[PDB]
Amino acid sequence: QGLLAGKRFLIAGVASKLSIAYGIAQALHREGAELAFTYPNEKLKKRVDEFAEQFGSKLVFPCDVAVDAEIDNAFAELAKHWDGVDGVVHSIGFAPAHTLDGDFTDVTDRDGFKIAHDISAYSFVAMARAAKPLLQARQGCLLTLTYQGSERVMPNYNVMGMAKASLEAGVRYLASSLGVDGIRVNAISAGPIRTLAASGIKSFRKMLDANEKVAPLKRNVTIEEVGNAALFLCSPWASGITGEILYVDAGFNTVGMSQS
Numbered sequence: 001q002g003l004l005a006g007k008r009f010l011i012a013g014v015a016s017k018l019s020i021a022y023g024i025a026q027a028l029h030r031e032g033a034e035l036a037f038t039y040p041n042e043k044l045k046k047r048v049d050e051f052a053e054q055f056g057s058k059l060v061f062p063c064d065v066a067v068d069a070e071i072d073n074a075f076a077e078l079a080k081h082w083d084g085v086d087g088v089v090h091s092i093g094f095a096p097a098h099t100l101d102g103d104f105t106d107v108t109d110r111d112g113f114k115i116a117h118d119i120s121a122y123s124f125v126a127m128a129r130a131a132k133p134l135l136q137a138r139q140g141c142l143l144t145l146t147y148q149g150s151e152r153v154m155p156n157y158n159v160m161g162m163a164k165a166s167l168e169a170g171v172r173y174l175a176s177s178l179g180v181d182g183i184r185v186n187a188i189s190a191g192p193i194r195t196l197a198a199s200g201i202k203s204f205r206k207m208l209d210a211n212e213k214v215a216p217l218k219r220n221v222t223i224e225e226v227g228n229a230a231l232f233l234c235s236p237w238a239s240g241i242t243g244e245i246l247y248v249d250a251g252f253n254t255v256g257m258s259q260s
């Protein structure tokens with residue numbers, strides 16, 4: 001029971017055992033954390049129930065982040081079980097499919113823009129607000145996930161690149177707001193990983209192949225590697241670290257073009 005013994009974390013974002021949020025769950029659990037989970041809808045409820053049970057948790061709450069009331073209620077229900085929280089992991093993204101398929105200028109309509117930012121960036125700030133009393137109780141941390149398409153153009157990432165740039169600025173604004181309470185706020189910028197959301201971005205196979213060919217370690221990263229980095233940033237070993245975007249991409253972001 002070894003780095004996170006006695007600590008409690010809420011995990012939002014598990015869709016399958018392939019999910020980044022699932023590899024994060026696995027790493028925190030391996031070092032002693034007790035876990036709670038959210039689900040976005042009725043259909044997902046059944047799967048998240050099973051996954052939680054696998055980590056030895058009966059703490060499973062609805063949280064569609066489009067709805068203020070569900071965010072608020074998720075943390076209200078959580079506080080009936082836990083008197084404080086050591087961490088909240090936000091591993092959630094969405095944009096309507098059409099926004100990610102085609103020319104950016106033509107396909108980025110108002111509502112598609114609205115939804116991508118609302119789900120993928122606003123929701124982190126809303127979760128942080130709702131979590132604040134429970135995080136204050138234990139000087140808990142916040143963690144979210146981002147992608148380098150915020151800083152450089154990636155094919156068909158499109159408005160998700162805007163929303164991720166917004167999320168990363170949020171990580172800094174949150175860190176400054178919550179830091180006085182000892183609440184650290186960080187993000188991992190992961191390399192491409194084959195998840196359910198990944199199927200559904202048409203350029204994903206090309207991104208995954210480019211990352212394998214170009215990254216200094218010449219291979220793709222895993223949810224275990226992302227989970228392990230998440231474990232570090234959620235632990236006391238990262239007590240000097242806040243507002244940080246940690247790249248877990250095998251060094252890809254550092255290369256301008258590989259040797260041919």
Ligand SMILES: NC(=O)c1ccc[n+]([C@@H]2O[C@H](COP(=O)([O-])OP(=O)(O)OC[C@H]3O[C@@H](n4cnc5c(N)ncnc54)[C@H](O)[C@@H]3O)[C@@H](O)[C@H]2O)c1
Pocket residue numbers: 012013014015016018019020021039040063064065066091092093094119145146147189190191192193194195196197198
């Ligand atoms: N897989 C990758 O290559 C990759 C790389 C870098 C960053 N990311 C980011 O990692 C995070 C995790 O995604 P993933 O790749 O694990 O995909 P995933 O499909 O496993 O997870 C996406 C999750 O978002 C949740 N979600 C979507 N809309 C929601 C709503 N309204 N309310 C609550 N939850 C909602 C989904 O239910 C799902 O659980 C996302 O922010 C994604 O942008 C992914």
Ligand SMILES: Oc1cc(Cl)ccc1Oc1ccc(Cl)cc1Cl
Pocket residue numbers: 092093094095096146147160191192193197198201204207
């Ligand atoms: O951000 C991501 C980056 C990569 Cl390379 C792969 C998957 C990603 O995650 C998503 C991409 C599109 C949608 Cl609609 C929702 C999510 Cl969660």
